[PDB]
């Protein structure tokens, strides 16, 4: 998620949003909190041990460090039996004031429910979860990982995220495509204008979690620049610029391996090359540039003198596909769009668009090609 918005830390000057990143000045604080996470300690013990740190230091930062450090811990497996039934049937024995009668109540309740009750009686409650493996993080890295999480937390409110290209642009779109992002490429300066989670009204949650995976690659580059437009307020909305370039104090620690999978573009390639022989299928064709808008198709297919381009689109909105196709009227070719019905709110229908559910139904692409080959 990044961080809860209650812990977001930023200031607005004029029309710009400046994030309050952690710096070396926060190393002391980071070390003293890192020392508090030791194996065999309860999270609620740590909540009480930091209390004085919330008097000395910025408590939005103190809380973020703890919520990040807990995210790197291993806790015990959940209890066999839901712990609230452990306490209803243990606390029904009133207050026990004799030590011997207590042990017997315990064993009586442990035989009825078949578990070690004391080990699990409060296991469903954050305050009582005991740490088994402590995180390995360094003070520098936590600061680094805080800052990347704060950046992500703020980009979740972005209407638009303009990414400017140094080196690996062809490597960026790949990930953006494998993540299904919504974007427009341009060329005045070569840049990608990703639409941000404020575009979506529906599945922002799932969109943002992938946009953030794209940051990881961007900021690994030698030269990068992003300008986000952020939207704040419910009924009077104003837009703010977040401008950020070549900031080296970022680091991801979310592995998030196996989230951006090219299941759909690859299967389609197999199915089309096998079932269609009349067309030649070129993959990752050179992008086209029409009056300084870049169009990066997924496939070019040709039969003799007919040439048509295929783009697959992961997320979408009514206003996005309308904009994409409007801009595609000026590309001077036939172009076939393949939309995912699950990643939309409106179940779209167009003269050049084929929806797909979990894979592309090659039946329909074959059908589509001849119904205008004539």
């Amino acid at each position: 998620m990044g961080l809860p918005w209650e812990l977001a830390r930023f200031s607005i000057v004029k029309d710009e949003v400046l994030p309050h990143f952690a710096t070396n000045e926060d190393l002391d604080l980071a070390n003293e909190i890192i020392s508090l996470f030791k194996a065999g300690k309860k999270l609620g013990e740590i909540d009480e041990e930091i209390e004085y740190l919330e008097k000395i230091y910025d408590h939005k930062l103190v809380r973020a460090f703890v919520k990040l450090l807990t995210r790197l811990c291993e806790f015990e497996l959940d209890s066999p039996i839901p712990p609230i039934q452990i306490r209803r049937e243990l606390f029904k024995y009133g207050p026990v004031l004799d030590e011997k009668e207590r042990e017997d109540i315990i064993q009586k309740v442990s035989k009825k429910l078949g578990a070690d009750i004391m080990r699990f009686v409060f296991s469903d409650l954050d305050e009582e979860k005991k740490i088994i493996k402590a995180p390995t993080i360094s003070a520098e890295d936590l600061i680094r990982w805080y800052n990347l999480s704060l950046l992500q937390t703020l980009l979740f409110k972005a209407y638009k995220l303009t990414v400017y290209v140094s080196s690996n642009w062809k490597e960026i779109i790949r990930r953006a495509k494998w993540l299904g992002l919504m974007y427009f490429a341009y060329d005045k300066p070569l840049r990608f204008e990703f639409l941000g989670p404020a575009t979506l009204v529906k599945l922002t949650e799932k969109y943002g979690r992938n946009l953030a995976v794209l940051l990881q690659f961007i900021i690994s580059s030698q030269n990068w620049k992003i300008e986000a437009e952020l939207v704040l307020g419910k009924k009077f909305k104003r837009v703010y610029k977040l401008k950020l370039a070549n900031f080296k104090e970022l680091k991801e620690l979310v592995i998030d391996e196996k989230r951006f999978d090219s299941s759909v573009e690859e299967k389609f390639y197999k199915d089309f090359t096998n079932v269609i022989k009349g067309w030649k299928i070129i993959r990752e064709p050179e992008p086209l540039v029409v009056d300084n808008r870049v169009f990066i198709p997924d496939f070019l297919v040709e039969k003799g003198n007919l040439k048509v381009y295929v783009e697959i689109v992961g997320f979408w909105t009514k206003e996005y596909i309308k904009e994409k196709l409007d801009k595609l009227k000026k590309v001077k070719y036939p172009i076939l769009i393949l939309l995912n019905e699950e990643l939309g709110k409106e179940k779209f229908n167009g003269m050049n668009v084929i929806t797909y559910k979990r894979k592309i139904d090659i039946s329909l692409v074959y059908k589509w090609l001849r119904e205008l080959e004539n």
Binding site: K42, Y52, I56, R87, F91, G94, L97, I105, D126
Partner: protein, 435 residues
């Protein structure tokens, strides 16, 4: 002379000049808003001018049974108000303002209009009047329109209907009277002729400072008690008792060791830690001096030992053994202590982070009596919505926060014939209340 004094559409009119009256060309009289009635009548009487007045066309006072028995701070408030019969009574929430008011109503025996700010306070006042006065009152507000010798009405409809009702009720009771200086309502107050006014509030002061208008619109404050005052030894209705315990031998070792570390540091830098400005200095230095941080850590850690000493659990066992038959709630500040106490005695625990489903289950299984005892934390949870307990046992705390005192006043005001608050404190440890 023979001055005529007559009510008219929210004004008082007069043959003759009285201070605060001003001549009306439109009306051909000396006039002012009807609320000046009491004062100009008294101006004329005290100068032996015969006052022929048709001002108050009062509803008949209804038939009542007085079922009210007052605590004694409640009656001094009645005695205060009665001297001038124009004033505000400031009592905290739950100190029973309503019953002081209804007692006044029964003493005065004049038609009474009670002005409240919300629809829930209509139905509430309606209920209290049935119980404590045995009269189903008139209600104007929410869409109901009945008018009787005693009537409950919204501020909005009192303002709307002021010229019609301004002369019908001699007694005028403004609940939540801090609303009265607001823009619409202040002219409502001035349109009534009602010579007798009682305002009730726990929050007399306003951020716009318009409580300066009270003497004009309702009367000044004539009686005020804080919850702190009303939680005195001799005034409250529950006993407050401190039972003292000693630290463990190991606790005393650690506690004293921490105190020495802290004291030596402070002395090594010419710092002190006597008041809360001293604290701010130490916190300030702790941002950038490691040794100051560890000192402030010693302070916290030693305080934690004293507050959460295992000897308090041992004492708690003795208390729960002495009161096998009473309904006990144990309070802590820390959540971790609440879990120690729940594990040690197998009693339900409630913290601020308990799911609202279970939290509702626990307190109800408590009020029904399946749970004779529970423990609860108070950091980040108001002692609010809690049922009646005969016995409160407070383990730790940086004193008692005002709401806490207020909250516990409500849980034990219900409690019984006389209930008891026990606080467990440790003996040798230093006083940590910093001024």
């Amino acid at each position: 002379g023979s001055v005529y004094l007559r009510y008219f559409k929210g004004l008082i009119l007069s043959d003759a000049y009285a201070p605060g009256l001003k001549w009306s060309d439109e009306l051909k009289a000396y006039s002012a808003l009807a609320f000046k009635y009491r004062d100009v009548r008294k101006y004329f009487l005290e100068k032996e001018i015969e006052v022929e007045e048709n001002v108050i066309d009062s509803l008949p006072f209804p038939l009542i049974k007085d079922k009210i028995e007052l605590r004694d701070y409640q009656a001094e408030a009645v005695k205060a108000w009665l001297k001038e019969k124009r004033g505000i009574i400031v009592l905290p929430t739950g100190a029973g303002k309503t019953q002081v008011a209804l007692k006044i109503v029964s003493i005065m025996k004049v038609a009474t209009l009670i002005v409240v700010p919300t629809i829930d306070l209509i139905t509430q006042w309606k209920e209290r009047i049935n119980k404590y006065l045995d009269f189903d009152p008139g209600i104007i507000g929410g869409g109901e329109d009945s008018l009787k010798g005693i009537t409950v009405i919204t501020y909005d409809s009192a303002y709307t209907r002021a010229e019609e009702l301004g002369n019908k009720f001699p007694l005028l009771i403004f609940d939540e009277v801090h609303h009265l200086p607001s823009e619409g309502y202040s002219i409502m107050a001035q349109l009534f002729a009602s010579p007798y006014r009682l305002g009730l509030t726990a929050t007399p002061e306003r951020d716009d400072g318009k409580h300066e208008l009270y003497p004009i619109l309702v009367g000044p404050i004539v009686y005020r008690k804080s919850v702190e005052e009303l939680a005195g030894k001799y005034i409250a209705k529950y006993k407050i008792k401190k039972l003292y315990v000693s630290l463990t031998n190991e606790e005393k070792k650690r506690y004293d060791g921490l105190r020495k570390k802290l004291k030596d540091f402070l002395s090594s830098r010419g710092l002190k830690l006597q008041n809360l400005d001293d604290f701010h200095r130490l916190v300030k230095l702790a941002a950038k001096d490691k040794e100051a941080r560890e000192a402030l850590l010693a302070w916290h850690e030693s305080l934690n030992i004293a507050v959460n000493s295992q000897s308090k659990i041992e004492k708690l066992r003795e208390i729960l053994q002495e009161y096998k038959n009473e309904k006990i709630i144990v309070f802590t500040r820390d959540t971790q202590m609440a879990y120690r106490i729940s594990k040690t005695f197998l009693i339900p625990v409630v913290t601020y982070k308990t799911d609202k489903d279970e939290r509702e289950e626990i307190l109800q299984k408590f009020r029904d009596g399946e749970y004779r005892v529970i423990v609860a934390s108070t950091v980040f949870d108001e002692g609010v919505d809690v049922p009646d307990a005969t016995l409160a046992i407070v383990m730790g705390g940086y004193g008692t926060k005002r709401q806490f005192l207020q909250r516990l006043g409500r849980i034990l005001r219900k409690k019984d014939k006389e209930a008891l608050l026990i606080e467990i404190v440790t003996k040798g440890t230093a006083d940590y209340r910093l001024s």
